[PDB]
Amino acid sequence: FSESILESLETAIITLSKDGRITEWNKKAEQLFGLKKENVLGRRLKDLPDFEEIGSVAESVFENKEPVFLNFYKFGERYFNIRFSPFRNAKTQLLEGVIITIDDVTELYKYEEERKRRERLSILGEMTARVAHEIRNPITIIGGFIMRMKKHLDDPETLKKYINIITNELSRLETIVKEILEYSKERVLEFTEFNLNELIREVYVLFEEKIRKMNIDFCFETDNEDLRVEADRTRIKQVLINLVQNAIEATGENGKIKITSEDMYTKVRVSVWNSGPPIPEELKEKIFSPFFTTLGLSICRKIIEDEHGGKIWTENRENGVVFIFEIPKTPEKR
Amino acid sequence: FSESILESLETAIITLSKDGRITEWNKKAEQLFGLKKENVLGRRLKDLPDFEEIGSVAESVFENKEPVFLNFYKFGERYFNIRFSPFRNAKTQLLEGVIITIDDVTELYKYEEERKRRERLSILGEMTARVAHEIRNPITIIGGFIMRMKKHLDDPETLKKYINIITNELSRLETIVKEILEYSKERVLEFTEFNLNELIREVYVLFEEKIRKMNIDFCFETDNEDLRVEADRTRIKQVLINLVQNAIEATGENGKIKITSEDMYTKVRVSVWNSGPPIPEELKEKIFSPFFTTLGLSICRKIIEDEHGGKIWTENRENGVVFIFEIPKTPEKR
């Protein structure tokens, strides 16, 4: 709130008022987008090339209100982090303008790339092999049945369950393989505030029809119904998907699944406990690396663990096992 | 030929006379197999545990005469190179005994492992990805036709050519993928003397039935019919297989394939020229790395290039392209 001489010897900032027009184009902003304040002053922000969405983000911010932090945005050769913050003018208190803050980022993500990706090569060696093996195994069956069913000819149709589902069990393994092949090629990250439980439910909603099939005494408790978190919704989404996914058959027929979201002063704890066969002392960590069971956690490690931060570990209990993670509300604590 | 006090302050040696009994167990031999000369003297060599084949190698040497150099032999924790050399006693000149020489190897192959395999991780990253992609592509077709053919039901049988062969074209790609997945996991090597051309023919023999199908003006020349080489037959075998393989359809229908084995004082040159579409200046090397065409050379690089040594490059000519390699007769020159 004054001064505004200081205003411009720092990182970078842009103001979009009730259309998308700029009032102040920071001096370090210039030093990033090649043009000076004056010859861009009071212009619209979508007007610029290779640019676009930045506006479209401010747009739906104008309509949803609530601000955003982004992480991972490719502009030309540089990667980016951006910070959106809509505000109001206290004299009017109207629905005034939007503050886009930008952190000088590249001389960072490229120097925590080489302590990550250069180590991502290695596991994509041993594992590439060890799992590339798990490829042929149903391959030789699915391909093999094609050199088995094609000499009857035309079976009493009963060769459809034993064809599709065995073809299908490798198919979603191809998925849960390509999905791990993702774990090499990326690195977007999109942080938002939202009620966790509002997510928690949301997921179960989708599964429902099947959980309803396997007559499951599902059970969800929480000590708080008002629980918010800054994080990538779209993504901490998957995380749930796949604890749940596993604790689906992992307890299976007439099996039970208990979800728990417990508020703690600075951090939250979501847990998916199921019953039946636990897993021993050795596999407390040793399922974390790509490795599958008699699963495919993998990503779900680095999602909580490396993306947001925190932990995604597990334990035995109550003649069953649980899948727990913890991420502080605001990642701004790191 | 005397002295035999010196005999025993070096590397390692073992003599098997006309059964497989030892006359001299080198002092450095002891220092490798835990037992002294005397309590193993005049015993049979297959008698020892985890041992075996060493004898069986000397065996078929007793029957085929001609000696062998081996490279890559796992004995317990150590890797190995061994040297077989049957000999005769000039006074008798009979079919006397076999000399097994052993080179102190591990403090070598493990210290040219980490300048190889630690770099093998890297390509098995980018490529693992880039090619793991080439997996789903026919996967989505072969899996996709299963969710396409299974609702007719039972077609006029004409859905067999378009099912099997499209399933088949990924299947041998799975091969030519696992085959590249090999290129990580190994590292045996078995050097023998044999007439190259005696190999050269041998290969064509197998292909014949198909080359006969595509009425091919095949053409094989050589300035020498007596051409021997120390190398891994079993393996420089594949090499041929796959130049040939490519220069098969690469010139295809009413297409021509010219093989050439030209003796040079210290080294040999085998070339497979075909006609049609050459490949430009850029791909002189840029097909070497895993990369495929509109192939999969890969292994065939390191086979000639890194295993035996030498080169396996290519060039344009005569409105067509050739596939040439050169390996000295005796690898003992390195």
Next chain:
Amino acid sequence: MKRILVVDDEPNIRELLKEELQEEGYEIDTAENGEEALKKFFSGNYDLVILDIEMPGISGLEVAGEIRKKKKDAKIILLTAYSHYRSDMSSWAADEYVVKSFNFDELKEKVKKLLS
């Protein structure tokens, strides 16, 4: 009746989808490269488009961006050969993201959606 323009690299992959969407109730006009996908959209009427990424000419990424700037209310479904969870910056300009598996029952639900 609706008409869709579906674009991908391999000739074997295009022929597969054409006859999967003509099953649901559509007519498919197939395009090959991004420079010919542009010409197949300008002087006509097309209510949807399905695109890859890694292709000769230009990237399906940049391709979709050419459809957005011209036609403001264009319908862009991305479905590249390497599909996961919409994670590149350019795709937020594009509408919906489809994951390429032999499973065709995801695109059908989402082609059906973006036509009302």
Next chain:
Amino acid sequence: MKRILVVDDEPNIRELLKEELQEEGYEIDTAENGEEALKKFFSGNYDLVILDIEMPGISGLEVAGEIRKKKKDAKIILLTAYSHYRSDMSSWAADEYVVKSFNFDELKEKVKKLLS
């Protein structure tokens, strides 16, 4: 008539071969682990064996070596789940090497061979 002992890890993979060799003209008795593959060979009459490698109990590598020391004239065909070009030291004691693809027309030629 000939009787073969075929050993592998997954239950789904064993049932596939049993009914592929009973097509040619054989009878298949299936074994699971290397410690039970040994018991299924000792007090009987079996003219051939097909083995994997990466398995619980012990490695098909070492497994084949147990069949060689006992029965000098035993017939060992290796066919592990990760098959290429016979490149480990132990396999030279074993007889013939088979490459595991959905292609079953290599083993048939080589099972047929090592029975004369």
